[PDB]
Amino acid sequence: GANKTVVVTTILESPYVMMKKNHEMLEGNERYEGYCVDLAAEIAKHCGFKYKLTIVGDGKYGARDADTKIWNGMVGELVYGKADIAIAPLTITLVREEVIDFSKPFMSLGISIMIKKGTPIESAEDLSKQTEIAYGTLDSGSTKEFFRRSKIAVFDKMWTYMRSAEPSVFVRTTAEGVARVRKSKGKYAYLLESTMNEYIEQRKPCDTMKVGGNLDSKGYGIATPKGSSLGNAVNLAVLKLSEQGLLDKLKNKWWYDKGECG
Amino acid sequence: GANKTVVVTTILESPYVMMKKNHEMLEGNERYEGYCVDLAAEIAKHCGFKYKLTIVGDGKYGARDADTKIWNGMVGELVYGKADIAIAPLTITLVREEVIDFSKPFMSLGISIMIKKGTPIESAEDLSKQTEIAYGTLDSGSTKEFFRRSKIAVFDKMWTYMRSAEPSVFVRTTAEGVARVRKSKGKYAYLLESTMNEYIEQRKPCDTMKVGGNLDSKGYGIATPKGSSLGNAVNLAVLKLSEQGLLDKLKNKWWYDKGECG
Ligand SMILES: N[C@@H](CCC(=O)O)C(=O)O
Numbered sequence: 147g148a149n150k151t152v153v154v155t156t157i158l159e160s161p162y163v164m165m166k167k168n169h170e171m172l173e174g175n176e177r178y179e180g181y182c183v184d185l186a187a188e189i190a191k192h193c194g195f196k197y198k199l200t201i202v203g204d205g206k207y208g209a210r211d212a213d214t215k216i217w218n219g220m221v222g223e224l225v226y227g228k229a230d231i232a233i234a235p236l237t238i239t240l241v242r243e244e245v246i247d248f249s250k251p252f253m254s255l256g257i258s259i260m261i262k263k264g265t266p267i268e269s270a271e272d273l274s275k276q277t278e279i280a281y282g283t284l285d286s287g288s289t290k291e292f293f294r295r296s297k298i299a300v301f302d303k304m305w306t307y308m309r310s311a312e313p314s315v316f317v318r319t320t321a322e323g324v325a326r327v328r329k330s331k332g333k334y335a336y337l338l339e340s341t342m343n344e345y346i347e348q349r350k351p352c353d354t355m356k357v358g359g360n361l362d363s364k365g366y367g368i369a370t371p372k373g374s375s376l377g378n379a380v381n382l383a384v385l386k387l388s389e390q391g392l393l394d395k396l397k398n399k400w401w402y403d404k405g406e407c408g
Numbered sequence: 409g410a411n412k413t414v415v416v417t418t419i420l421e422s423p424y425v426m427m428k429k430n431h432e433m434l435e436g437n438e439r440y441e442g443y444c445v446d447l448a449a450e451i452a453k454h455c456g457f458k459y460k461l462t463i464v465g466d467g468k469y470g471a472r473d474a475d476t477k478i479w480n481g482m483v484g485e486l487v488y489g490k491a492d493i494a495i496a497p498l499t500i501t502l503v504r505e506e507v508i509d510f511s512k513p514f515m516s517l518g519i520s521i522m523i524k525k526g527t528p529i530e531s532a533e534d535l536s537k538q539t540e541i542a543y544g545t546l547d548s549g550s551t552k553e554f555f556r557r558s559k560i561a562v563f564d565k566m567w568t569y570m571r572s573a574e575p576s577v578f579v580r581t582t583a584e585g586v587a588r589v590r591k592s593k594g595k596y597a598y599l600l601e602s603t604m605n606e607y608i609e610q611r612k613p614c615d616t617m618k619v620g621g622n623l624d625s626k627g628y629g630i631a632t633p634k635g636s637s638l639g640n641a642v643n644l645a646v647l648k649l650s651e652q653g654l655l656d657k658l659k660n661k662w663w664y665d666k667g668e669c670g
């Protein structure tokens with residue numbers, strides 16, 4: 147069959163995908179910049195396809211409704227055939243691996259704690275043993291599922307608190323979670339992946355920090371519909387780009403070369 | 409077809425696979441202990457197979473002879489059908505992914521530098537810009553291939569030195585490389601994966617240390633022959649064990665609960 151345009155689903159998540167400054171006057175793929183935008187171009191080059199970047203319609207990574215069993219987010223766009231590939235900071239998880247294909251990981255990370263500077267919190271155990279400082283996670287993502295499923299004493303205690311906290315401690319986007327840390331004068335801490343935490347730590351106004359070690363160890367992968375013929379070539383491209391040092395170069399470009407806090 | 413015993417290829421590499429103290433009086437799988445021995449039992453349980461642990465015949469991880477194109481080590485045992493699965497600290501690489509199947513990674517790591525304490529070396533750049541202190545890597549492994557293929561200025565310079573150094577700076581086993589660091593009074597440094605470096609740093613006589621950051625970022629995966637029906641179930645088992653915290657528990661058990669340097 148003749149080549150067709152590969153539909154790429156992704157998510158507005160800094161520094162992976164961001165609107166360029168002049169984006170209102172730009173169109174198509176040129177509206178966007180970031181780590182995943184650069185990565186998409188590299189994957190397309192090595193695999194030999196043309197592509198269109200599209201921002202996921204519901205703004206979500208992907209979770210399965212416990213009642214209706216329907217997948218939302220970027221995972222849903224792959225499951226229902228609305229996109230051909232997802233190039234995003236999409237965490238490789240068991241429940242997702244059962245319904246979509248993943249490349250080997252292009253980035254390693256773990257769940258981490260973001261505080262406003264000066265907050266008297268050093269660890270998840272600290273958060274779990276107090277109630278003055280609220281804390282939460284992103285909706286429809288792997289971090290929330292981590293706490294929902296954990297049998298580790300500290301993390302189960304944190305989940306029991308978060309699921310019933312009022313007002314809600316869950317946010318719709320990472321940016322909302324970060325904004326809540328910044329505006330809460332230290333009374334809200336945010337549970338997010340170390341990649342995004344470390345990025346924000348280097349962005350103005352330089353008022354947040356990552357505390358403690360990571361709570362787990364996992365990776366982001368490029369996702370394709372289960373059984374898609376594109377997955378094999380995409381996986382080999384990730385491995386080649388990793389071994390050539392390109393992924394390290396892109397991490398340095400978007401996290402630290404552009405750091406704003408010194 | 410009726411179930412048959414799964415032949416597991418692995419390698420004597422501490423703390424992944426080690427001879428038990430009384431091993432001369434033990435037989436079968438009971439001769440061995442370590443992270444990979446525990447992991448094998450967990451994978452077998454979740455996938456529902458019986459298995460026999462076998463130590464790779466040539467003691468190697470796996471490389472392809474540039475002339476004869478033949479694979480040695482554990483990769484060769486899978487390629488030629490002498491083993492059904494490899495449960496070992498086997499690095500996921502492009503050239504291996506082309507000939508065998510890999511699970512998603514069960515451990516993350518990077519290449520690192522081991523010195524005898526007091527050696528005046530802090531980085532790969534330091535090693536590359538001097539000649540008093542020799543340095544080398546393991547034969548037939550992914551670290552040697554890393555330096556052989558690198559186009560990064562510092563690492564290419566190090567390869568050009570290592571490939572022609574006399575006497576040879578390459579070793580046959582990790583243990584030989586560690587012993588050479590310890591006996592060379594600081595005149596040999598060893599390039600090895602951070603996992604093994606960090607383990608040795610916590611073992612008697614506590615005379616080595618890991619210096620500098622990791623040179624790359626990658627992972628170990630469970631390997632199966634290409635197209636093997638076992639790979640799918642093995643991959644889901646790794647992800648479940650990761651998410652249940654078992655891999656973290658096993659890392660703590662074999663690296664740090666058993667640390668000997670404080
Ligand atoms: N990377 C996560 C989203 C962010 C988070 O959950 O912290 C996912 O794929 O669901």
Ligand SMILES: N[C@@H](CCC(=O)O)C(=O)O
Pocket residue numbers: 469470497498499546548549550551552599600601
């Ligand atoms: N894990 C490596 C062996 C150790 C090394 O090369 O440093 C491999 O799979 O080849």
Ligand SMILES: [Br-]
Pocket residue numbers: 238251364365366512513
């Ligand atoms: Br992973």
Ligand SMILES: [Br-]
Pocket residue numbers: 250251500513626627628
């Ligand atoms: Br990997």
